[PDB]
Amino acid sequence: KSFWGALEDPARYLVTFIAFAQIAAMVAQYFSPTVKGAVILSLVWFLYRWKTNVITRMLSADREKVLTLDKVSSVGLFAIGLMASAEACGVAVQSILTVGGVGGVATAFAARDILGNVLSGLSMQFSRPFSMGDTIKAGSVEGQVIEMGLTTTSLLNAEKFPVLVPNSLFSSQVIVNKSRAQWRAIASKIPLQIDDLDMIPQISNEIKEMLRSNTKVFLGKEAPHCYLSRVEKSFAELTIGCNLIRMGKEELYNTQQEVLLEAVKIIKKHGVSLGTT
Amino acid sequence: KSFWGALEDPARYLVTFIAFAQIAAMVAQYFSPTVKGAVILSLVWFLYRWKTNVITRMLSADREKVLTLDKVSSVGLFAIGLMASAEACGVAVQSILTVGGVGGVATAFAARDILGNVLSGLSMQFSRPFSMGDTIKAGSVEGQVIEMGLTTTSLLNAEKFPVLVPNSLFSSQVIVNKSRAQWRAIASKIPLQIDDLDMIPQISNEIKEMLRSNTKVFLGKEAPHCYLSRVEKSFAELTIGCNLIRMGKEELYNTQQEVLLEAVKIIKKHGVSLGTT
Amino acid sequence: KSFWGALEDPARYLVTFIAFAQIAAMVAQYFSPTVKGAVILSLVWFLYRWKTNVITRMLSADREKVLTLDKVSSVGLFAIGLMASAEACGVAVQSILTVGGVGGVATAFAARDILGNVLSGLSMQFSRPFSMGDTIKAGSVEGQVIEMGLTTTSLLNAEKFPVLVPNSLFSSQVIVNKSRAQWRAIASKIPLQIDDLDMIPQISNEIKEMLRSNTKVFLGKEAPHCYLSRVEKSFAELTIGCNLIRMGKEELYNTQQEVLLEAVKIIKKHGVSLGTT
Amino acid sequence: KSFWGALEDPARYLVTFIAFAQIAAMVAQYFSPTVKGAVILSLVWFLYRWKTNVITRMLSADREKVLTLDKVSSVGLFAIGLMASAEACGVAVQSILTVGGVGGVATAFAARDILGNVLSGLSMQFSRPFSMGDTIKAGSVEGQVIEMGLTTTSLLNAEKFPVLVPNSLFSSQVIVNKSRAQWRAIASKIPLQIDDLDMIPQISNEIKEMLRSNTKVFLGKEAPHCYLSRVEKSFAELTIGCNLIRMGKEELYNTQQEVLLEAVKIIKKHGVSLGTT
Amino acid sequence: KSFWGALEDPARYLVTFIAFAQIAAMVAQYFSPTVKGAVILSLVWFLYRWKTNVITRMLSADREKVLTLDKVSSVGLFAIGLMASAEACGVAVQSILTVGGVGGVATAFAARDILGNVLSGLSMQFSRPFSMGDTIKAGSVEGQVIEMGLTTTSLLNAEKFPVLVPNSLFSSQVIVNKSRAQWRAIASKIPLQIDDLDMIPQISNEIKEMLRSNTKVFLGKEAPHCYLSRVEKSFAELTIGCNLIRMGKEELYNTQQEVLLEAVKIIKKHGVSLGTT
Amino acid sequence: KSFWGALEDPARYLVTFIAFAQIAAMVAQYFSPTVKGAVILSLVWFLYRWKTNVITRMLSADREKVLTLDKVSSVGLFAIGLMASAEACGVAVQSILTVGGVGGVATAFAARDILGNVLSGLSMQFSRPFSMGDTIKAGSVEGQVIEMGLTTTSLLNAEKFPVLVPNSLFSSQVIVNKSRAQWRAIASKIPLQIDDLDMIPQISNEIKEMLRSNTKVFLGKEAPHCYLSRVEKSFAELTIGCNLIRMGKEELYNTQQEVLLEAVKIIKKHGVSLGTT
Amino acid sequence: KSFWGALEDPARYLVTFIAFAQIAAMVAQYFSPTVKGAVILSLVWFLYRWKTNVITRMLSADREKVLTLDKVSSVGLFAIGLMASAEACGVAVQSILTVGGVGGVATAFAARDILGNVLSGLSMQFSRPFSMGDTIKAGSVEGQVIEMGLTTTSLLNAEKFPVLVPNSLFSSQVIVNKSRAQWRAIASKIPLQIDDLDMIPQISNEIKEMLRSNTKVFLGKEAPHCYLSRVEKSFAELTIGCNLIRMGKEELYNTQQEVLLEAVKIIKKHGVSLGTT
Incomplete structure (x- = not known):
């Protein structure tokens, strides 16, 4: 009983x-x-x-x-x-003991993956690399954490499908935590159709001024940059970039579009035109 | 007897x-x-x-x-x-015991794959990552589950062929479950042949309005976006995207086509034309 | 004697x-x-x-x-x-026993491939993943099974050469069985040179009607689809697809060609022309 | 108690x-x-x-x-x-001792990653390959060190996301320390549209003179170079390069842009024009 | 003595x-x-x-x-x-016995490649996958067998250099035997510059007739095929193929050239012209 | 005390x-x-x-x-x-002895990388593959040796950053020593726009004469070559090459540029012009 | 003493x-x-x-x-x-014996590379795959053998740098011996701008005649070939090839150039012109 x-x-x-x-x-x-x-x-x-x-x-x-x-x-x-x-x-x-021992080692190496998942789940329970809701990127997979278990973690990827990651992948690979960033960083490249490069400095400086006079930029670590990365026949490439304050994901898109439009405005103000890659 | x-x-x-x-x-x-x-x-x-x-x-x-x-x-x-x-x-x-022991360990490492398949089949019998009929994607293979065994799973892939996946592949790799998604997410890119970027904001906003005024969109998690992702000589690229309600697979195609046609309609309404990648 | x-x-x-x-x-x-x-x-x-x-x-x-x-x-x-x-x-x-034991383990790891082939041949003798004459695809090799042994399988590949596959490859990799499919699935992409997208719906629907009014299509699982997958300046791409009944391999080719010609006929009937990728 | x-x-x-x-x-x-x-x-x-x-x-x-x-x-x-x-x-x-021993070796191989991380953390505590704040590049990841632990290191990558690198990756891979460099090195390629190559030497020498007459160059190890790397119909490619003094990261960009503009100025002074790759 | x-x-x-x-x-x-x-x-x-x-x-x-x-x-x-x-x-x-045992296992794992080569040479002596003179393809190497040993095989590759393949590569990889084929198979693709696809069926059928009325074709397994594989603006692609009888290697080239010329003749007979990929 | x-x-x-x-x-x-x-x-x-x-x-x-x-x-x-x-x-x-033994083997496999680095450092101390200051290339890394230790070597790569290579990489990979070469070898390809190939021999021979009449060439091992590697409509490609005496790195650049200019001079002397790849 | x-x-x-x-x-x-x-x-x-x-x-x-x-x-x-x-x-x-045994197995697996190099050096001392001066190609490295040791071989690669190959790479990979070839084999492809393919046979045959009437060809194993490998609008591709007698390396270049020029001469003699890939 x-x-x-x-x-x-x-x-x-x-x-x-x-x-x-x-x-x-x-x-x-x-x-x-x-x-x-x-x-x-x-x-x-x-x-x-x-x-x-x-x-x-x-x-x-x-x-x-x-x-x-x-x-x-x-x-x-x-x-x-x-x-x-x-x-x-x-x-x-x-x-019989030798038979049992070779059977035990057969089973013990055949089960290295289940044991890896369990031990890595415990190790993650100690050094928490993420929490429920964080947007992580582990190796080839990326998405929002929707469930944390002992042998598997569950994500929601970019197509909004539930992915099931074995926990032994969080011990051998790097984990990017897109939810703990305190400032963002944008970078773009603008092609110019220009033959009188004598105005590449001016434009450049002006653009940088624009990026420092913009709210939603972060002047704490690195300064906005805009330099000439490559030149060619009636062609040039400006590499622009800056840091942004901690913002959402629609505001990041809006800020990217706004910075790009203001940069192209400054470029066309100096009589230059965009080039063709 | x-x-x-x-x-x-x-x-x-x-x-x-x-x-x-x-x-x-x-x-x-x-x-x-x-x-x-x-x-x-x-x-x-x-x-x-x-x-x-x-x-x-x-x-x-x-x-x-x-x-x-x-x-x-x-x-x-x-x-x-x-x-x-x-x-x-x-x-x-x-x-003789040493001979038998080395033969046993020869056989026990030679059989690591069969044992892996069996043990992973049991582990899957505990933490069910899918069920019969689900559309899964395991590493390089993807299709509808048509049979679940102890050492192999059977799928039906995109060409409608029966695939036979050893069960030791569901313990070392991530599994995407396309049949447990609660909302979908579409994203596309439209090229524009535009020189007066002064109307890239307007267009953008209008498109987003269209994506929020559309049934079959999901405004619970993320808002529809449409931003300028790259610019060039008489060329621009708009990146559109949104979430959709839980729908079938022909309705997903119909909604994609409908959103694309409405976006191009809004674009051509403002006197802009499509560009050439 | x-x-x-x-x-x-x-x-x-x-x-x-x-x-x-x-x-x-x-x-x-x-x-x-x-x-x-x-x-x-x-x-x-x-x-x-x-x-x-x-x-x-x-x-x-x-x-x-x-x-x-x-x-x-x-x-x-x-x-x-x-x-x-x-x-x-x-x-x-x-x-002497230690010498013999280290020699035995040397030989027992040096022979892991022969033993893998034999044990996988037996495991395949239990769970038969194919039979003589089936057209299989194992990892990188594909062809018709012409001989099944204990340590190797023999295929006839696409150039009609006899390939010899070690049987330890059918336990670690997925096997596609092209001879057990009960219905086929075709999919193609047609480029269109079109500027008045106001007739992309009509065309689309008409094509789908054609695919349902065609014998040798299978309306049991999925419906024929034809949607607009990408647009561009005087350019569009229609993605067509359907399921076909269980047919041979020359009839599959004939049906593909016939569906493609009928689709292009419907497209040109609406005054549209094909585009250039 | x-x-x-x-x-x-x-x-x-x-x-x-x-x-x-x-x-x-x-x-x-x-x-x-x-x-x-x-x-x-x-x-x-x-x-x-x-x-x-x-x-x-x-x-x-x-x-x-x-x-x-x-x-x-x-x-x-x-x-x-x-x-x-x-x-x-x-x-x-x-x-029971055999059961316990096979369980112990199961657990001891299942935990090879946690133990690798700990032992590599100690080994790094002895031979310090970087310190807090250094900009390192370990295999596929790169960024500023923001935390050093016993089983994981924390970086801030180029998008300004916190990455979590297991410490067993710093023992099997090379580590680039971008914060301990004492001089920098720039190199670029300029295409020329030239048919009279009789002035490729002159130009070349002049450019090199310019790179030695520029402050922020380092003439301690290698001399500035500018040679003809490939020729073609009305086309040539000059490969320029030099070493720069230990400078910041905005000054490196400014110096690159300045060297490129001065080189193009020298090129156009000799009646040559830029080519098109 | x-x-x-x-x-x-x-x-x-x-x-x-x-x-x-x-x-x-x-x-x-x-x-x-x-x-x-x-x-x-x-x-x-x-x-x-x-x-x-x-x-x-x-x-x-x-x-x-x-x-x-x-x-x-x-x-x-x-x-x-x-x-x-x-x-x-x-x-x-x-x-001393422990020292000798660890030295023995050091030597026994250090010698896994020599032992693999010898054991695979014996295994090949049992199940002969090729013989002297056969044209084989093993993984990345291909050529005529010119020597068969116990630890290495010797080939003559396409540049007519003697290659030395360790025999442990014939147990883990597939072996293609180009000398035991009983019939060959050719396949080609012809591009057409055609706008009136109303004659793609006729042409196709005619070509197939030509491939069945040709000696040196093998009508035992599969029928000759010629189908439309893709269409485009004033462009089409015909995929032709057939099986050929067991022939040499200069006769295979001659037959390929002859089939290609006859196909282009049939194509141009119907007023169609070749396209440009 | x-x-x-x-x-x-x-x-x-x-x-x-x-x-x-x-x-x-x-x-x-x-x-x-x-x-x-x-x-x-x-x-x-x-x-x-x-x-x-x-x-x-x-x-x-x-x-x-x-x-x-x-x-x-x-x-x-x-x-x-x-x-x-x-x-x-x-x-x-x-x-307790079994517990200690499984802990010891856990630690002994977890520490295979540190031990590999130390043992490979000693092995390199015996068979010196390079010395301080040599420009080596080990697998994916390349640079000047700036420090040699027991578990790591320190290089200075092409961007003039200090790299830290674990010493277990110099035992499993090939090491190229760019500082022990006794003669150099240059090779280039020149495209020609030529329709009368009747003067491809002459040009070729003349160029070779030029390469033998040039100081800083090494006629000890191989003779200078200049052959026609591919032909096409109004197009040809000459492959030039030679050995050079042991020289610095700016003299190597100067010699390359000089050989290229002299070759183009000889080419244009015969009324031929450069082609366009 | x-x-x-x-x-x-x-x-x-x-x-x-x-x-x-x-x-x-x-x-x-x-x-x-x-x-x-x-x-x-x-x-x-x-x-x-x-x-x-x-x-x-x-x-x-x-x-x-x-x-x-x-x-x-x-x-x-x-x-x-x-x-x-x-x-x-x-x-x-x-x-103490257990401590010493786990230390011994730590050292014995940490030293698997040095032991592999030594044992493979001995195995190569038995089955000599090359000798001093031979031009070999082992996996990714290729060059002239300049030193043969017990743990490493020394080559001189194409840039004339001394490479140091660990001897454990000659037991797991194939070795190509360029110095033991008894006849060479050349193969090239010529594009033709031709619309009247009625003279592709003639040309072809003529070219083959030229390759058999040329000294420095080897008619012992395979006959010279020249077949039509692909056709297109006003375009065709001839694949030429033959075997050559055992010759040096400058004579191989001269023979390649000579065969190419004679083939183009025969092609232009029939009123055909070269095409453009």
Whole structure:
């Protein structure tokens, strides 16, 4: 019915058997082998009793999970009981133990991925690299964290599909956390159709002035830049960039578009025109 | 005929032999080695009897499977019986045990893929990452789940061919579940042949208005966007995008086409024309 | 001459020697070491006798195979006999056993590919992923199965060359079975030179009607689609697709060509013309 | 309450039990097995007492970390206590020890990444390859170091997102330290539309003169170069380059732009014009 | 001088020593350790004698090979003799045996490639995937087999250079045998500049007729095909293909050229012209 | 204070204890276990004393290094002392030894990279593949050697940044030494716009003459070449090349430019003009 | 001074000590442990004496090599002596032996690359795949062999730089030997601007005639070919090829150029002109 009976029955059988053997030998002397064999077999029987009670208790309340647990536990208990009984009796100890050891190492390397996922889930439970809702990028996958488990994490990627990442990928690869950034950084390239480069400095400086006179820029770390990155026949390329304050994602788009339009306005104000890549 | 006879014949032979040896020694004292050897050899004979009964019982009802099982089980039983008998007799114990151990580890690493498939099938039976009929994408393969087994999963890919994925690929790679998405997300890029960028804001805003005034859009998480992503000589690129409600797959196509046509209509309404990439 | 003589010569020599030793000790007491040494050496001699009889029997009927088997078996038997004799005598047991164990693990990892091929051949004999004549695609190779063995499969690829695939590639990679598909799926893209997109809906719908009014289409799972996938200056791209009934391979080509010609006919009927990618 | 009580309670119980057993045997002689069993069980109980005191002491002041530590430590202590008690009693020693050993090697290979990160963090604590604030580039990631830990380093990449690099990547890959450079090096390519190559030497020399007559160049290691790297119909390519003094990052951009404009000025002074790649 | 002397010198020394020790102990009793030590040391001396005789016999007839064999065999014999003598004497048995075991496993993993080549050479000696003269393609290499060895195969590649392929590449990769094909297969693509697609069927059918009315085609497996694979503005692409009888390599070229010219003739007969990709 | 006291305190305690036990047993006989336990515990205490003296001596003169060494050494000493004391007492020997062994192999595989770097640093100390100042190229990195250590080498790459290469990369990859070359080799390709190829020989020969009549060419190994590598409509490509004497890096550039200009001069002298790729 | 003294000092000390102990026990009986300890410690001292003599002898004649050898040998000897002395005394045998074994396997896997290089150098000393001066191509590297060692080979690549290839790359990869070819093979492609393909056969045949009437062609294996590989609007591509006799490298260039010019001459003789790819 419970653990109490599942113990009491084998315990009373074992005490009965050892008390029988004691007065079977007192009034040919292999008390130790038989007593150890009885202890091993009774303990195996008690473990079987407890296992059946528990997964019968679990099915008296997620059901094929209970059947899989029952089958796997019966396999494991049969293996352990066979090894321990062959060692208690003394018949073919090293042979059966070697078989069991090579089976154990087969199973232990075959299960390196499940164990990796579990151990990496725990390691992530210690050094939290992200939290629920953060937009992360792990190797090839990227999206919003929607579930954190012990063997897998669940993301929502750019097409808004739920992705399932095994937790052993967060220990061997770098993790980008797009939700903990305190300032953003934009950079673009504008092509110019220009032959009189004598006004590439002026334009450049003016643009930088515009980027410092713009709200939503961050002048704390790096200054806005706009330099000539390559030249060619009636062609030039300006590389613009700046840092922006911590903003949303529609405001980032609006600021990018606004900076680009103001830059092209400054460029066309000096009589220059855009080039063709 | 059954397990009962397959046991009683060796059990009665063993009891006969040990009862013979007892009164062969009472009225030179190696009772333990001979008795352990008899137990080992009788147990091997009983296992052979039971194996033959079972795969003769299985062939008295998927036939080359039974022959393969018979051959593999005979190989394994010969190995185990040789090891155990050499250990019971005492002749070249460690030599034969070392040979058997290196053979076991050869077989145990050679079989890492079959064991990986089985263990990953069980792990998937616990944490179900998909179900029958779901459209998944696992690494390089993608399609509709049509069969779930213990060592392989079966998909139907985009050309409508049945693919057979070993289950050890669902533990080391990310799984995208296209059938559990609750809203979709579309994004496109429109090129414009424009020289007066002074109307890129207006157009943009108008398009966004259109995407919010459209049924089948999802305004719960992110707002529709339409920003200028790159500019060039008489050329510009608008990046449009939005989220859509949970819809089928022909309605997704229809909505994409409709959004694209309405956007081009708004663009041409402002006197702008499409560009050429 | 046979197994009978190959056994009764060493068996009679061993019985003679142990009967000699018994009355050599009865009328200095190392009966056990000498008897175990005699058993080991006689058993090694009997195994040599049986091996020579068998591969002499095999060469009295595929000949360099027999010579290779003879050489490999003599190597293995020399190794096993040396280990067992050094353990029976008692001279340098652990040294020679360690040498033999490191040689065994060298050979057991050096042979991981042959063992992988054999074990994967058996695993495929259980869960048959294809049969003789099927057109499969395994990773980088594809063709018609023309032979199925235990360590290799033989295909006929697209250039009609016989390919030899090691069977350990069918356990770590996905297998596409092009011969078990129950319906096909075609998809194409048509470019249009169009400036009045006001007739992209009509055309689209008409094409879909054509794909549903065509025999050899499969309306069981997905509906035919034809949507606008990208637009550009006097340019548009229609993505067409449908499912087809289970057909041959020349009928699939004919149906593709027919669908393409009918689609272009519908397109040109509305005054539109094809574009240039 | 503390370690003192957590020790004295089991120590006094053990001393009581061994003093009982001594006069239980003096006035059947298995003093050693029972005494060793009592020592093992008392030590396991004391370790449990100390563990509960410590992680109860830690929760009487970063809380789910304490719960995870408690669970992991209870798992480990149960494993160790089971092994040691089965070895003290003598029941199924080698079986349980083999099970525990294969479980230990499973866990020890499953945890190769966490251990790699920790050991590489220590190795980096010895041979410091960078410090806080340095701009490093490790394999595929690059940015400013913002945090240095034992199992992970934190960077700020080019988009100004915090990246989390596992410390086992700094032992197998090269690390570029962009903050310890003492002089910079610029190099560019200018295309020329030229048919009279008889003035490619002159131009070249003049440009080099310009690069040596420029402040912010470093003439300590290598001389400025400007050579003809490829020629073609009315086309040529000059490869320019030099070293610059240790400067900031906006001054590097300004110097690049200035050198490029001066070079194009020299080129156009000789009647040559820029070409088109 | 020979094996006879190399044995009867150590054998007579050993018999002399054991006969001395027997009457040294009969008229302090460590007969077994000294006798086993004498047997081990005499056997090591005999092995040294035999090794020197053999590689002196081999150098009395490919010479640096003999010197390398001598050095390697002396290294191995020193290792084995040191282990066995330390185990016979009894001084630091487990220490020296552990050193020797870790050295053996170092050497056994360092030599995984040589052993792989040898074992794969034997496996290829059983399942012959090609023979001398066959044109094979193994992974990245392709050419005519000009030599087959035990650790390497020799090919002649397309530039007519001798390539040396390690035999462990024929067990992990697929092998294409270009010399066992029984029929060939050609396929080509012809671009057409056509606006009236109303004659794409006719042309197609005619071409197929031409491919069936041609000798050197194989109508046993698949029928000749010619279908429209893609269309575009005044552009179309016909995909032609067929099987050819088993022919040489200059006849294959001639047949390809002939089929291509006849197809273009049929195409231009219908007033169509070739297009431009 | 020193090693002398750190030894003579535990040595005198141990001698006192064994002299006590001797006359505690002479006037119940477990002299060996208690004496071995005392030796082990005294030796552990002495090692602790010596460790504390040394890293207190090192901190009485590169400080966090000393703290890390102290912590790591205390961890290691606790592990070793626990193992040795549990083995001396006799309580749970095999259990604790198995735990320690699996921990040791965990740490020994987790530290394969640090050990690889150290062993490869030593191997490089024997077979010196470069020296300080040499310009090397190792796999993906290239630059001037600026520091050679035991676990890492330091380079200065093309952008003049200090790179830190782990020394385990110089044992698995090829190393190019750009500072030990004794002659250089240049090769270029010139396109020609030519329709009368009847003067491609002449030009070619003339160019070769020019390359042999030029100082700074090396006529010791290979002769200068200039051949026609591909032809096309009014287009041809000449592939030129030669060896140059051992020269600097600005002279190599000057020689390349000079050879290119002289070749184009010879080409235009024959009425040919350059083509357009 | 030499090996003689380095042996006769420890040998005389050991004989003195055992002769002392014998009459210390004759007129408490632990002769075996003390004698084995004395033998082990004397042997360790003798090995230290011999090591110091040898590397003092080597430094009395490539010097930092001797210091590295001295340090490494002292480390190894300390390890071996500690293990053997702890095993002779009997204090913490299995603990120290386990520590030493895990250290040995750490070092034995950390040194897999050095051992691979050495073993592959020996394997190459047996099956010589090239000799000094041969032009080989191993994987990604190619050049002339300029030095052959035991752990590395030295090449001279195409830029005439000395490359250093680890010898473990010649066992896992294919080796192309450009210096053992007996005939060469050239192949080229000529584009034609042709609309009347009725003269593609004639031209083709004529070209082949030219390739058979040319000296320096090899008509032993394959016949010269020239076939039409692809056609297009006013465009065709002829694929030419042949085998050439064993020639140098400037004669190969001359023959290529000559064949190309003669082919273009034949092509233009038939009124055809070259096309434009």
